[PDB]
Design a protein around this nucleic acid. Structure first.
Lengths: 261, 65, 66, 66, 66, 69, 66, 66, 65, 66, 69, 66, 66, 262, 262
RNA sequence: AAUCAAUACAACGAUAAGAAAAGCUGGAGUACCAUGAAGCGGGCUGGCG
């Protein structure tokens, strides 16, 4: 039976994640494609074979300043092509995108600004959202399927947050919610996790506070945006609380698809 | 010639990612490893050989020269 | 050579925005920065080299005189 | 050659010709000048057409053959 | 051209209507009036000129002998 | 080196009169046997004798395996 | 040169290569031989491919560069 | 099958939207995904197989030529 | 033949409810139980036999393959 | 095959089946005999039905399958 | 065994001159007695001779019951 | 084909005006000029070809004998 | 057979023919090509017409019989 | 000009009709189409050329036995099709119906049971009436025209019989039969050929087997020519000659402004 | 004689209804076809013979997720065919529609979203209403009769609710929903089975989960049996008792002067 | 007014079914969007079917 496992992990610094044990954890997950965001390390920094996984290929990109962003990608099979960038400054200069081209389906890692580090960060996040909306409107005409394992740092509905009365903080703002609704409705994209389970408490991000961990005041910042062609192939979805090695819990999603090159 | 050869030499020396558009409209991306009079080695995941007579335009991801 | 080279030189000197059209039909826009025997360098948002054997027509935005 | 005298006859007589590109785009106008590799077609906007992309040239009226 | 030139000369002398397929896929028909190294004069309803580099196949209406 | 591969291959195909498939760049597939050839055109014979320009020929596929001299 | 040593390396190691034509049709097989204009492609049936129609040559596995 | 198979293969490869009319007059629309001797699989809003013995006319949105 | 047999085989194995339109315009619904070269056993409340020469088109409710 | 065993099972058990024709009119009765092209349907009056006009065979009760 | 039943049935209908009603695929009701038949056509006659094609015949309804040979 | 061929041959030789009714109810009239295995040529105002697979009945204006 | 020479005469002479379908719809155009099962009718839009859905072929002018 | 003459005569046995000179009379009437009812002769009985008319075609149907009943029809032109039976026992088993198909318009004859020979006859007559009403309701949706020269053996209105007060107590003028005829005429849209051009009394068609009935003109209008509503304006003239007649039913001659052809 | 009894009950979870004794009550009602809405259970859950009824067949559909659930339908006679969904996502993905095919008339169960749990629910409800209006406009041209046992979750008139002044400000009596029902009833020609025989108030079908609503009779009419205009005259009687009920909706029993058969 | 004065998509359209029209020289198969798609090679025995 066709079975493919895709894992999206926001690390907020790949060095600290590796020091906490992310590599040994990923080695046992038996996943096929691993998606990492916010590595905070340059391409030369990741050249170290310590980050290499047994039986996995490594592709990644970096920004002009490595501490500001940068994403990575692992794959059990050698992809046909590895591309990066969308065509505008907020993605090209920051290296927040990396796409691996497989047969019929294309897996792309995506990273959005946090938006909590100032009004300038919020404006940059809004510009990135608008540019990505334009990109998706232009891209929805293609036939190949896209899997956007993008940590958009924005929750969709009240079921994705705790104590929403969240609306006064970056991550659940009205324009961001409207943008997500537009993406999921007008553009026709389907969320991977919500196509198989409409249950609460499945959060993906927690503030750096003991109260948020104890009271489960978490937000769902991790997403795997699927084209309307792959909404039916979702098999399983999970968001394990522990042993996450960052402020974002790993998002494991299984698909009824056989990956080939 | 006088312009294409220095342009491709600068592109391959700086290792800048370039977008190579073919005549049929299909876009290729990668880093130019080496070239000559007829073919351009576009290297990224696999070292593929691309013929010059089918390339429409080469668009670098960042300004050069 | 008697018409192509002078036309391209005039377009480069006058800095007239030209609309390059490829053989398949994908229209490009920008200003001619330089050229030679086989390629044409077109600059707009980013400098890009356009091969001559893939160009169909060149349409300046304003009339020119040689 | 026969292409050069034919194009020269089309130019001196100012016969409106329709140019079908290699893809299939129909261009209309009058031939103003030409050389070995490009052909200048003038109408409402002056444009240069490359010979390696031209498939057929169809005049609007019969002309003298070389 | 040991083969193309005599074949085209025979087709011109015999005045056989020929079907010519372009690279874009369309088929043109008419009579070969004359030819040189780069173009072929195709006469039918309008005396149109066709370039050799855009011609894919030549289909005469009846078999001929060199 | 010149046409040390194309000319002998086409000469063998012409002498053996093996039916070959000629694929054009626009997607049309032709069938027949090659009567003769030169540097620019190939004479194709089937229902009617037709000439095919080499600059539009993408691939030449014989109907059976052949041996080169 | 670069094209000839690259094709010779592909031929010597018998690496299966994927050859995308200009129209998008993908061929698969190994290189038997090559010259200035044609490439002998081996598969279930022996076929010849013209270089003027080959857009890209994509080997299935990385090889030593010339 | 000298005309049906090449026509359907061209319509499939070119991804041209085709209008398939049944014998009873119901108009179908979409792109041909694949076919054989008896059925034609149409791709539109929902992938649905159309039998050949019920097809009357196939009208592509843009012309094609063999 | 080439693909219609694997198509019906997939529709049978996955048990997808399909809409089968007849030549006269009448729409049927149900599942394929079995088939051969001429008949298709539409299966729901009544296991009826539908002839292929009268089937206008088969429209599954969800995409397959 | 499938049609032959199905019709044989329907004939052996004499299940009253409804046969719908291509024009939409429903026939009623029990299958008496059949061959390759016709099916003898018996009811108030014995009538022969051609297979090329039979659209569906809907029994009144479920029956065994091959 | 293409016509193991249809041919004997038509022969029995013709032997007894039983007036049979032939309904076409379009719903038109024909009447008369079958003069003869073959593999693809059926000869019908009630006032004027008339050949009817089998590919358009839907049902053959005799006006009186018959017996199989 | 023991009855079709002789009947059609007699209708052709005797030049009897025959009425041909199609499956859709359309009534055709004229004289049979010739026929084969699949088409029947009906002559009246225009020598139109009628396909056999669309013909339902043939009604001669006067009785004929084999 | 006589269908093939009739269709050949209709095609080679460029006779505008009207094709009536089984459902009564009237088509118009010129027969571009044909084979055993389909007939390609071209006019303002090139459309393929299946033979099994054709009822009558009515040329606009009389044609020579084989 | 288009002119067509149709004669409908119930013979109650074609043998006595031919013995009384009905065939010669019909040949002398210059009629175009003739419809006969209650021939009481089988197909083998009508094979005798004595019943044949000079220059007229002959088609007929019979029941299991000749004495049971049967109808016949004559036509000057060879019809496109001649059909019999309706699909139920009361007409097919008795052969009381025969229809001739021509261009555009079809002419048909029909025979209804008397119903006076017993209660079972009346029940069979009512069943025949219901089945014929169903057939007419199914047939009225067609485009072609129909001419039903049917001896219904029932009067429609009081103008069709003499002394209707006593006629209501006998089969032929009963309330259910009158309601059935009213339904057939109004609801189904069929028109009477005689009433479209002549709305006068004393135009009877059948007389009982009694000299007093013939003396006092106690006749019943049991014969009708039922036409589709499309041909109501084509009726030119209609005649009901009391004498000479060759059966219990008088001849019914109706002229039309129509040209018969195939 | 001919008699047909159809019952439509919204259960809001078939498990709680079975625990409250819905099946034991339905078994004694002698109904012919039972339509259940909002089962809140997958098709595999209804496979349990606990929900099975003696003398009734069990056909049902389920959504992708069991929380949304689907609709079920019981029938005494084996239907000709069972169809589900309409052809759009808000009905197909949720399985809120099921229709059994019988002769002449077909019975269908329908479930609409509540629309009270968030604005997204109201938007989905409006989309479902528009798509169903399109489907009904396309379907009204057919000849066969349709019986829609649909829980619309929308009131029609003020007589269908208590204290309409406050009902206008809550989902169930909004202006767009009222206009939608008016369009469906007048322009398309569909009729309500309950109003064809009883035009009286207080015949509410749904009550809010509150003791004050039960005591003060603050009920709303959310359940309807939508019929084609051909069956408006065949409605015999309609029964809707206030108690006992096994959910927030009351059982709706409607009798027809029609013989259900295949 | 035609090989898309240069690229390409969307726009809506099938009576779970009439125990059956001796037959109509022929019913019909709009607007708007839109400038580069890691690439879809369709039998028997030359005689026949």
């Amino acid at each position: 039976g066709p079975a493919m496992r895709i894992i999206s992990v926001n690390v907020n610094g790949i060095q600290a994640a590796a020091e906490r044990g992310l590599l040994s954890w990923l080695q046992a997950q038996n996943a096929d494609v691993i998606c990492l965001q916010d590595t905070r390390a340059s391409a030369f920094d990741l050249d170290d074979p310590s980050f290499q996984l047994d039986g996995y290929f490594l592709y990644a990109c970096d920004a002009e300043l490595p501490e500001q962003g940068g994403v990575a990608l692992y794959s059990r099979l050698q992809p046909k092509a590895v591309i990066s960038g969308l065509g505008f400054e907020t993605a090209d200069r920051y290296g927040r995108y990396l796409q691996a081209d497989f047969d019929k389906v294309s897996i792309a890692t995506l990273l959005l600004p946090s938006g909590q580090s100032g009004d300038e960060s919020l404006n940059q996040k809004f510009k990135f959202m608008d540019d990505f909306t334009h990109y998706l409107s232009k891209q929805r005409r293609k036939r190949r399927e896209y899997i956007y394992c993008g940590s958009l740092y924005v929750a969709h509905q009240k079921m994705d947050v705790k104590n929403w009365r969240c609306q006064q903080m970056p991550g659940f703002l009205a324009p961001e919610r409207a943008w997500l609704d537009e993406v999921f409705g007008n553009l026709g994209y389907a969320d991977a996790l919500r196509e198989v389970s409409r249950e609460g408490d499945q959060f993906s991000w927690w503030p750096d506070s003991e109260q948020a961990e104890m009271l489960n005041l978490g937000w769902r910042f991790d997403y795997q945006v699927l084209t309307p062609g792959l909404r039916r192939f979702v098999r399983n979805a999970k968001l394990p609380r522990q042993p996450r090695f960052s402020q974002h819990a790993p998002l494991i999603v299984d698909y009824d698809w056989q990956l080939s090159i | 010639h006088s312009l294409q050869d220095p342009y491709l030499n600068t592109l391959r020396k700086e290792r800048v990612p370039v977008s190579i558009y073919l005549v049929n409209g299909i876009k290729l991306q990668g880093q130019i490893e080496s070239f000559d009079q007829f073919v351009i080695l576009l290297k990224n995941t696999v070292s593929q050989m691309v013929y010059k007579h089918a390339i429409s335009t080469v668009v670098p991801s960042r300004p050069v020269r």
